[PDB]
Homo-oligomer: A and B are copies of this chain.
Amino acid sequence: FLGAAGSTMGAASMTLTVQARNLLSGLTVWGIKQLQARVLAVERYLRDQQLLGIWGCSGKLICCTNVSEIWDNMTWLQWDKEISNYTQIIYGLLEESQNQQEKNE
């Protein structure tokens, strides 16, 4: 599952199908809290799909976009923390690029 977390950014790209499937596949009064938890889990799933939708990456695990070269000595949980402060800019740019791509329709 998360076994590739400590390897390298490149190699970990080969386990994307494992992680994607495992996040969706998984008396009653106090239990309302569990019902709320189930609904929230569904919304989290859809939130990611909805971002892929507006960015034009729907249905993909590896999406090519329109917006040094290491990928060996750095891993996920390192590199992605370093760009935490830049990431929101990127997300805005990904949406903007798709908004312009949509002109051709």
Contacts and interface: CB of A to CB of B under 8 A. Distances in A.
A105 to B, nearest CB: 6
A3 interface: no
A47 B32 contact: no
B103 A13 contact: yes
A17 B59 contact: no
B38 A35 contact: no
B105 A17 contact: no
A103 to B, nearest CB: 6
Interface of A: 13-14, 16-17, 20-26, 28, 31-33, 35-36, 38-39, 42-43, 45-47, 50-51, 53-54, 56, 58-62, 64, 95-96, 98-99, 102-103, 105
